[PDB]
Amino acid sequence: GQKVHPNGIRLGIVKPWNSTWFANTKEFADNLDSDFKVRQYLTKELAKASVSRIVIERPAKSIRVTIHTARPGIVIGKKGEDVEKLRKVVADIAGVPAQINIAEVRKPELDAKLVADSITSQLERRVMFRRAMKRAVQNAMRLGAKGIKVEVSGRLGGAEIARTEWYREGRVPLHTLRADIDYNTSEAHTTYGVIGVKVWIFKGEILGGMA
Amino acid sequence: ENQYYGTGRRKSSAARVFIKPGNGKIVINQRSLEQYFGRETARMVVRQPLELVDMVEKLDLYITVKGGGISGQAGAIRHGITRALMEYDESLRSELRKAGFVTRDARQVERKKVGLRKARRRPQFSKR
Amino acid sequence: PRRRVIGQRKILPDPKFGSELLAKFVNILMVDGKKSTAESIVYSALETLAQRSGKSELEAFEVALENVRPTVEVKSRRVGGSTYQVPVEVRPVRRNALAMRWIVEAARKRGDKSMALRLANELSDAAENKGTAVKKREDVHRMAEANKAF
Amino acid sequence: NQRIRIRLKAFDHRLIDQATAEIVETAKRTGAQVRGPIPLPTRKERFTVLISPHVNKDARDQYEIRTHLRLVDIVEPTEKTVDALMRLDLAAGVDVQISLG
Amino acid sequence: PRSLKKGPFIDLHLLKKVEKAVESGDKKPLRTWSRRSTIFPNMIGLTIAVHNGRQHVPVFVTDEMVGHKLGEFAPTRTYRGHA
Amino acid sequence: ARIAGINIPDHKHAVIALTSIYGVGKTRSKAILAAAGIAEDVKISELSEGQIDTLRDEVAKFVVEGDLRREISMSIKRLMDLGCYRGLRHRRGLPVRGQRTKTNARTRKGPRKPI
Amino acid sequence: AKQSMKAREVKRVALADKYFAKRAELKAIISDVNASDEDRWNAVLKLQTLPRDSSPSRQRNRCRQTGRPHGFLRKFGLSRIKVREAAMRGEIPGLKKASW
RNA sequence: CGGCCGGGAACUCAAAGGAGACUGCCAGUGAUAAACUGGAGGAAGGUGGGGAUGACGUCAAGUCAUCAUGGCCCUUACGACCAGGGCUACACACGUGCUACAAUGGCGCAUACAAAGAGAAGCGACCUCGCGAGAGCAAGCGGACCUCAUAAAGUGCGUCGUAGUCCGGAUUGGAGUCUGCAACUCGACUCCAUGAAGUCGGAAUCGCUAGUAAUCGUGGAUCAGAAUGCCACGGUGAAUACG
Ligand SMILES: [Mg+2]
Ligand SMILES: [Mg+2]
Ligand SMILES: [Mg+2]
Ligand SMILES: [Mg+2]
Ligand SMILES: [Mg+2]
Ligand SMILES: [Mg+2]
Ligand SMILES: [Mg+2]
Ligand SMILES: [Mg+2]
Ligand SMILES: [Mg+2]
Ligand SMILES: [Mg+2]
Ligand SMILES: [Mg+2]
Ligand SMILES: [Mg+2]
Ligand SMILES: [Mg+2]
Ligand SMILES: [Mg+2]
Ligand SMILES: [Mg+2]
Ligand SMILES: [Mg+2]
Ligand SMILES: [Mg+2]
Ligand SMILES: [Mg+2]
Ligand SMILES: [Mg+2]
Ligand SMILES: [Mg+2]
Ligand SMILES: [Mg+2]
Ligand SMILES: [Mg+2]
């Protein structure tokens, strides 16, 4: 059967939104489109910078983008020239003054997006999928994730018949709403087509809710 | 004097009852009981609590109602009269509860669900 | 209910006469949730029946029920691939339900103009054993005797 | 003096509650009295979308956006109160509309 | 139908063509695609080849056709029966 | 009794009985009765001869019965002779006001003709 | 959808914004009760002569990310599939799965 | 005589935070039990009602026409622009719905009670004109304020008196309104005129366990206009379950 998106079901319960501005119906569509363009551009421009999350806020007549990345130094560049460039182009796209803040994620092995991107990179470099995902699971469980599941699907190894393989370690309670499940996905474009990767990381059950 | 108060609710109707000792007046929304409820069943329903305890002709009721329909408003008025009597006396608890007036009938209206014509009615199925 | 634990539902009595039998009769006659129409029909029918017989409204309704009430019906039980209509005694609650249902069906399939008058005429013919409901009860008993052997 | 109304709109009620708490605490600190926050009816916009790419009408998702509204009235606004409120720096994600008279 | 206080619709190019044809006596048919234009009394007695999707079917405009559409006088679907 | 060359029902009320004329409906019946100063509730056989003459004049004010029938037939004949789309539909006996013909045209097509 | 279709929509929007004022004034003079008959006739003809795509009734709303012409939602400017994907990713403020 | 206006935080209500319901208590049954049944208290009693939530997998299920993509094919054409036409055909078959066949009703008059929504290239009041769809001027409203917006079924009085009818509205003719560059193919609605079939439906078959079925209206998305569909909201409100 089909399974609900974990982040989607847990929005407003244990998970926060990635876009936290308020707008009326007049400016809602334009703000969505501008945020989409900013996220797309930043993803393309920092694809090699281990960027985990982009949180766009639109205070008053400005836009502030917080970039959660594992390599804040490589995102900032020399003394801030790369941040300056990014702010310039982001402001250009959004039509309002922009401000970029970098947030470092010190545990990339516990971020679902970064784990999925690492597996996808290894797949496009032609590392064996089972070894890649097994190492990912071992790394996360060793760094302390309460549980992890990785699933790799689609023409694995260049075979004719596609299949899906998954590995799970520890507990990953998807039906428990208060469970903190960081879920993310990625696609590897290899010479035989698209290989999909999904990663769930369970890091504990928030008891106070805290929205 | 004391103007004891009782809030009643039924379906989507809320009623505010003010009972004070007096004659047998019942003035709902500045109108008489019959003029507000022409239906004799609704009149009987409103009269039910006052008939159960021997206080029909010795209390004056000022009643306001909003929301719902005829039957819902009659039920809300009955509930409010019950609560007001309960506050007035507090010995009638047993008799009114035994008669079933104290319970708030919580049956609301099931929302319509996707893929169904109504709350439960499903579209007609054919094998072929 | 294979699991069971199903129970009957409490029905409030009618306002004018305070009878559960009359309330069930009103509910059986009611169509499309128009309880006021059905209640007015029943009350007019009972008033004119009280004019006709002059005992009581509730007593007249009860006497009609007495006449109509079946004592045994037939339930299908498959035995040899085919079914045998086995006679079974009806519990009093179901007796009342079937009597009221037959009275309403007979009153609906009548020829008089108004529904209140149709109901009054059906009740009189039931209380004097000359109605369609009476005929139906006689038929049920007649078939039960014919199929006593099963 | 004329009272000044502040209507706060937000998608998150904790954010709007904390912002209203800050406004009322500031206004009571700076001398004036406040007759608010009056929770106002929250709007719930609902959307129903087909979730399958091609077929299957009956498989649908239902989402909602809940907009919360608080109303704060500052009465007898001291000269300081107005600019203090306009320099309170409310949290991002809260639309604030200030009317006068 | 079109609101009266607006008036009857006619395409400008067709109006110009009809004006030229009535001012010059041109008996050659008026080839047109404007099925939606209303027939005016100044077109009476004129051959107009109105498009029907595949060809220009001629209609001899006479007095009885005033107020109707050239599209009303040029069928678009061909049907001769199922059996 | 006899209006516009047909017999009007005697036991029915004036309005409904006046509706028996081809070309006179409920609204026109009300209009005629109000233009003749006659109650609608009164039954047709409760009236004097003069009132029947007034009704005759008021019906003669409208186009009814055979005049209306021949006007309608002439309008349809004009359509059919003109060769417009509506005329072709009348000629072929198909619904003329854009109704679907894939199914549901039986009022025009008549009882079903199996292949 | 096709790039040609998306360009068609862009061009239609451009022309519609360009010819707004004349369109509106011509419709006003046509609608006006206290207007001359020759004036109304000339206004009708000029409105007929304006380019067709200048009419806002010709533009069809399309998903801003894919160009799909069905399932549109004006609040978000997206079709149903992209709305759901962004909502699940948490990129649409306040939007969350609704039960009641 | 209008919460309307001084005025009050009593009450409905609006949200925010909490309390409460757990076989907790009593009795019986039960296997020294899990549990079940009944009773008290209680707004609620045994998952209180409803929703969201869909395990490992099956159907080489559906989607290359949302999107992305491996391959294969076209490149003065399988690419692109335009006008008209078609997707709305019509001997027929099937599926899903609406409206009826009437008196528990139709029509006329008087009068009563909702909830949830939408609104700025928008909702559009009052007033005047039109029988009507609507038109003219135009206040207010980014809306617990203003508009959509009079709920209908119901109740009371009268008539119709079992008819193919004062049932039913299909179909067709004439005249119009609005949207729109433009209603012929091919819109919606209004007025007048006509008034088909239809008198409860064969084998067979479907939905439904309580505020449910049945019935009555209202709103929204899409949308210049165009719902009998879809999604929501409330009003009246059952029969039965032995097994
Ligand atoms: Mg699902
Ligand atoms: Mg369906
Ligand atoms: Mg059509
Ligand atoms: Mg493409
Ligand atoms: Mg359009
Ligand atoms: Mg109990
Ligand atoms: Mg569960
Ligand atoms: Mg297949
Ligand atoms: Mg399938
Ligand atoms: Mg296929
Ligand atoms: Mg074209
Ligand atoms: Mg089609
Ligand atoms: Mg609103
Ligand atoms: Mg009949
Ligand atoms: Mg009729
Ligand atoms: Mg008519
Ligand atoms: Mg017949
Ligand atoms: Mg069930
Ligand atoms: Mg309906
Ligand atoms: Mg709308
Ligand atoms: Mg529309
Ligand atoms: Mg309902």
Curated annotation (Swiss-Prot), chain C:
Q: Name one GO cellular component term.
A: cytosolic small ribosomal subunit
**Which GO molecular-function terms appear in the entry?**
mRNA binding; rRNA binding; structural constituent of ribosome; tRNA binding
GO biological process terms held by the UniProt record: cytoplasmic translation; negative regulation of translation; ribosomal small subunit assembly; translation
The reply on keyword Ubl conjugation is no
Write down the superkingdom of origin.
Answer: Bacteria
Keywords from UniProt, A to Z, are: Ribonucleoprotein, Ribosomal protein, RNA-binding, rRNA-binding, tRNA-binding
Name the reported effect of residue 115 to G.
Significantly decreases affinity for its own mRNA
Family of the protein in this entry: Belongs to the universal ribosomal protein uS7 family.
Per UniProt, subunit arrangement is: Part of the 30S ribosomal subunit. Contacts proteins S9 and S11. Cross-links to IF3 and the P and E site tRNAs.
Q: Remarks, anything else? A: The strain K12 sequence is shown.
Its function, per the record, reads: One of the primary rRNA binding proteins, it binds directly to 16S rRNA where it nucleates assembly of the head domain of the 30S subunit. Is located at the subunit interface close to the decoding center, where it has been shown to contact mRNA. Has been shown to contact tRNA in both the P and E sites; it probably blocks exit of the E site tRNA. Protein S7 is also a translational repressor protein; it regulates the expression of the str operon members to different degrees by binding to its mRNA.
- This chain's protein is named Small ribosomal subunit protein uS7
Gene source species: Escherichia coli (strain K12)
**Name of the gene encoding the protein in the UniProt record:** rpsG
Q: Which residues of the full protein are shown?
A: 2 to 151 of 179
Swiss-Prot record, chain E:
Q: How does it assemble?
A: Part of the 30S ribosomal subunit. Binds S13 and L5 and cross-links to the A site tRNA.
Name a biological process GO annotation: cytoplasmic translation
Q: Name one GO cellular component term.
A: cytosolic small ribosomal subunit
Q: Record's HAMAP family?
A: Ribosomal_uS19 (MF_00531)
Functionally, this protein is described as follows: In the E.coli 70S ribosome in the initiation state it has been modeled to contact the 23S rRNA of the 50S subunit forming part of bridge B1a; this bridge is broken in the model with bound EF-G. The 23S rRNA contact site in bridge B1a is modeled to differ in different ribosomal states, contacting alternately S13 or S19. In the 3.5 angstroms resolved ribosome structures the contacts between L5, S13 and S19 bridge B1b are different, confirming the dynamic nature of this interaction. Bridge B1a is not visible in the crystallized ribosomes due to 23S rRNA disorder. Protein S19 forms a complex with S13 that binds strongly to the 16S ribosomal RNA. Contacts the A site tRNA.
- InterPro entries to which the protein is assigned, alphabetical: Ribosomal_uS19 (IPR002222), Ribosomal_uS19_bac-type (IPR005732), Ribosomal_uS19_CS (IPR020934), Ribosomal_uS19_SF (IPR023575)
User: What Gene3D superfamilies does the annotation carry?
Assistant: 30s Ribosomal Protein S19, Chain A
Q: For this protein, what is any one GO molecular function term?
A: structural constituent of ribosome
- Among its keywords, does the record have Thylakoid? no
Record protein name field: Small ribosomal subunit protein uS19
Mutating residue 82 to Y leads to what result? In MW145; suppresses a rimM deletion
- Keywords for the protein's UniProt record, in alphabetical order: Ribonucleoprotein, Ribosomal protein, RNA-binding, rRNA-binding, tRNA-binding
Q: Which organism is it from?
A: Escherichia coli (strain K12)
tRNA-binding listed as a keyword? yes
Curated annotation (Swiss-Prot), chain F:
A biological process term (GO) from this entry: cytoplasmic translation
| Reported effect, residue 104 to H | In PW095; partially suppresses a rimM deletion
Keyword terms of this UniProt record: Ribonucleoprotein, Ribosomal protein, RNA-binding, rRNA-binding, tRNA-binding
Q: Which GO terms describe its molecular function?
A: rRNA binding; structural constituent of ribosome; tRNA binding
The superkingdom of the source organism is Bacteria
Q: List the disulfide bonds.
A: none
Q: Which PROSITE patterns match?
A: RIBOSOMAL_S13_1 (PS00646), RIBOSOMAL_S13_2 (PS50159)
Q: Which stretches does the entry tag as region Disordered?
A: 93-115
The reply to whether Iron figures as a keyword in the UniProt entry is no
Q: Which GO terms describe its cellular component?
A: cytoplasm; cytosol; cytosolic small ribosomal subunit; small ribosomal subunit
Regarding protein family, the annotation reads: Belongs to the universal ribosomal protein uS13 family.
**Subunit record text:** Part of the 30S ribosomal subunit. Forms a loose heterodimer with protein S19. Cross-links to the P site tRNA and weakly to the A site tRNA. Forms two bridges to the 50S subunit in the 70S ribosome, contacting the 16S rRNA and proteins S19 and L5.
NCBIfam families the record matches: uS13_bact (TIGR03631)
Described function: Located at the top of the head of the 30S subunit, it contacts several helices of the 16S rRNA.
Q: What is this protein called?
A: Small ribosomal subunit protein uS13
The record lists the organism as Escherichia coli (strain K12)
In the UniProt record, what gene is named as encoding this protein? rpsM
UniProtKB/Swiss-Prot annotation, chain G:
Instruction: Cite the entry's keywords alphabetically.
Output: Ribonucleoprotein, Ribosomal protein
Cellular component terms per the entry's GO annotation? cytoplasm; cytosolic small ribosomal subunit; small ribosomal subunit
Mention any Pfam family matching this sequence: Ribosomal_S14
User: What GO molecular functions are on record for this protein?
Assistant: rRNA binding; structural constituent of ribosome; tRNA binding
Disulfide connectivity for this sequence is none
Gene3D superfamilies annotated for this entry? 1.10.287.1480
Cross-referenced InterPro entries, in alphabetical order?
Ribosomal_uS14 (IPR001209), Ribosomal_uS14_bac/plastid (IPR023036), Ribosomal_uS14_CS (IPR018271)
Q: Does the keyword Ribonucleoprotein apply?
A: yes
Sorted alphabetically, the Gene Ontology BP terms of this entry are: cytoplasmic translation; ribosomal small subunit assembly; translation
| Family note | Belongs to the universal ribosomal protein uS14 family.
Provide the assembly information: Part of the 30S ribosomal subunit. Contacts proteins S3 and S10.
Q: What does this protein do?
A: Binds 16S rRNA, required for the assembly of 30S particles and may also be responsible for determining the conformation of the 16S rRNA at the A site.
PANTHER family in the record:
30S RIBOSOMAL PROTEIN S14 (PTHR19836), SMALL RIBOSOMAL SUBUNIT PROTEIN US14M (PTHR19836:SF19)
UniProt name for this protein: Small ribosomal subunit protein uS14
